[PDB]
Every structure is written in C-alpha cells, then in structure tokens.
C-alpha cells in the first residue's frame, strides 16, 4: 500500500528578479522512502542540489526538503521533477512565484 508524493515548489524569501535566493522542493506524504528528486531550469537539470535528512510523520509517510541556490529573473522557468513507485510516470511541479 503505497502513497503518492505531495510536492511544493517555492522560494525561501520573497522572490525578486536579479537577486540571489533559495529554491525549495518540499516532498511529503510518500511511501516507500526511496525517491528521486530533480530540480529543473528551462528543461535542463540543476546539478548542485542539496537534500535534507529524510524523516517520517505519525501517519508513517516520509518527507524531505530539497533545495538549490538560484537567482530568479523575468523569463526563467523553474520546476521540480519527482520519480516514485506510486506513480506510473514522473511528476513535474512548476514554480509559481505567487505560491
């Protein structure tokens, strides 16, 4: 009995073009714990991506924080792809700077 990952893509500080910032990918509500989290930029994969220690909550499901430093602009599109056995194909969530 597996569980599909809930994903939130968002920045640490209020976004502002041409100013350095951290981009988060908070993945939760997933089981089994094995998972791949890729962060994207205009399609291309971001090479330098940190990962928090994995934990699990009182409903047994796991959660983890992935993040990478980035400088937002007018026209750059950032996203976060996630592979998991619960899903038939990967799940790409795109960054909305108002969410």
């Amino acid at each position: 009995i597996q569980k599909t990952p809930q994903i939130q893509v968002y920045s640490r500080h209020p976004p502002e073009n041409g100013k350095p910032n951290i981009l988060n990918c908070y993945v939760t509500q997933f089981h089994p714990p094995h998972i791949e989290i890729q962060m994207l930029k205009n399609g291309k994969k971001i090479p330098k991506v940190e990962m928090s220690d994995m934990s699990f909550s009182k409903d047994w499901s796991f959660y983890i924080l992935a993040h990478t430093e980035f400088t937002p602009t007018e026209t750059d599109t950032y996203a976060c792809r996630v592979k998991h056995d619960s899903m038939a194909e990967p799940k790409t969530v795109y960054w909305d700077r108002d969410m």
Binding site: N24, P33, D98
Partner: protein, 278 residues
C-alpha cells in the same frame, strides 16, 4: 505540558545494493535532538540541537553502541517478516517504529506508546494500558502471541514509565530556553487578478516557529473553510516555516473579506485585509 520524548526508527531492506539502512531519530516535543544513520561515513549517535552538546562522552558511546545492536535486531526482523508474508528476498521492505512517552506540566505520564508498521501499514501497537497489544493482521498475531507469553509488554512498561519519563525530564532542563521557542509570523495579503470578474486574495504567514499555525479567511463573521484553499505548512530551510491560505472573491469586493492568523508567539491573532499602495 504536554511534553513528549519520541524515537522514530526506520529499517529498509535493499537487495542488490547493500545492507539494510537503519535510522533512529529522537524528538523532544517534536524537535529533532538526536539522530543515528547507518549510511553515514562512521555510524554514531550525533546531536541535532546545540543544547545536547552538554552530555558527556559516556552518553554518546552508550547510545551509539545501542543503535548498532538495534540495527542487527531489525536486520533479523526484516528477514522474519519475509517469512510471515512469504515474500521474496529480492524485494525492498520497510519496517518503521514510533516509541515514546508524554508528560504533562506536572511531570506525570499522560501517554506511553509503541507501535510498529511494515511497508507503511500498521503491524502491531502497544495499548494505552501498557499491558496488551493490538495486531493489525494475521502476521502480527504471531508477534502478539510471542510478546504476550514472553511477558514483553511488562518490560516495555518499565522503560516507558520510568526511563523515558526520567530522561525526557532531563532533556527539558538542558534545553529549556531553546524549547521555549517562538517566532511570530510576518503576515501579508497579496492580490492576484485575472481577465475575469473574480480575483484571488492570498494570505501569507512567513518566518514562524513552531510549525503549528492556523490561517482562516472570513466573510463578515463566518469562516469560509469550504471555499478556502490552503497549502500544508512547509519549511523555509532556515528553522522557520511558511504557510498561505487563499480565497477567490468577486472583483471590487476585496474589502469585504478578512484574513486571520492564529499562532502561539502572537499576543493576539492578527487580522489582515487587502490594502493597495495604490
């Protein structure tokens, strides 16, 4: 109160990769204060809060050697459950356990508990009496029969009532100022229009700790839980958390709606409304 000392244990079999991975993670009032991970360069118990650096070397050695012994036990338990479910050795499986105790402001034991789960499903759990168990399926009835005739619940009762409480009591004193912890949220309301007769009002709460928080939108008194939309509380990545709730409202009726932020660190709940510069 209520204060808690919980230990979260994970054991995952990894056929065709290596040995099973093992993690223990201790929490004090839902705050990670210790951690052990077998996939580290040199597996040992390490502090996850700076108030734990008080404890001496004998503590760390004792907890470290204990974790390695626990790893081997869960290594055997993984192979035992394969037998109970008649499962293949070449498939990955996950055993999880939460085991802890809770105390009130007085220090008395409110609830002691320990519960297991296999592949994300409840397996067996110790009842609130701390005497009998509750098996989740036919496999767990085998374990239920063992521990009852073994009298294992009684040995757990000693740990949960005595040891767990006494140590929890100790940690709270060592990290009293750190666990007193409160950052008030910085809150605001953004306006997100659209080529349409409606607009989206979004209420934010940033830079707050602990993660416990409640955001609500109200229309002239009543709370709009059904038509509201909100995200689960999320880490900013610097010790604080974020959250937002939103509502879609008619164009030109933004001042009719009111956002409310409820949080420990606040003297009183914040009351927010859409305001332009303009």
């Amino acid at each position: 109160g209520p204060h808690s000392l919980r230990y979260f244990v994970t054991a995952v079999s990894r056929p065709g990769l290596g040995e099973p991975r093992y993690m223990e993670v201790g929490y004090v009032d839902d705050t990670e204060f210790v951690r052990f991970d077998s996939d580290a360069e040199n597996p040992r118990y390490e502090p996850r809060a700076r108030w734990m650096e008080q404890e001496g070397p004998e503590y760390w050695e004792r907890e470290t050697q204990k974790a390695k012994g626990n790893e081997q036990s869960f290594r055997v338990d993984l192979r035992t459950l394969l037998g109970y479910y008649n499962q293949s050795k070449g498939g990955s499986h996950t055993i999880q356990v939460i085991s802890g105790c809770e105390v009130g402001s007085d220090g008395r034991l409110l609830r002691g508990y320990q519960q297991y789960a296999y592949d994300g499903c409840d397996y067996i759990a110790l009842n609130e009496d701390l005497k009998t168990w509750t098996a989740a399926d036919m496999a767990a009835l085998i374990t239920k029969h063992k521990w009852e005739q073994a009298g294992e619940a009684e040995r757990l009762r000693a740990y949960l009532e005595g040891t767990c409480v006494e140590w929890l009591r100790r940690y709270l004193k060592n990290g009293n100022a750190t666990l007193l912890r409160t950052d008030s949220p910085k809150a605001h309301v953004t306006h997100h229009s659209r080529p349409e007769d409606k607009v989206t009002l979004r209420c934010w709460a940033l830079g707050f700790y602990p993660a416990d928080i409640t955001l609500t939108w109200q229309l002239n008194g009543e709370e709009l839980i059904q038509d509201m939309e909100l995200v689960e509380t999320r880490p900013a990545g610097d010790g604080t958390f974020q959250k937002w709730a939103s509502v879609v409202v008619p164009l030109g009726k933004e001042q009719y709606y009111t956002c409310h932020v409820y949080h420990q660190g606040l003297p009183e709940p914040l009351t927010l409304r859409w305001e332009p510069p303009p």
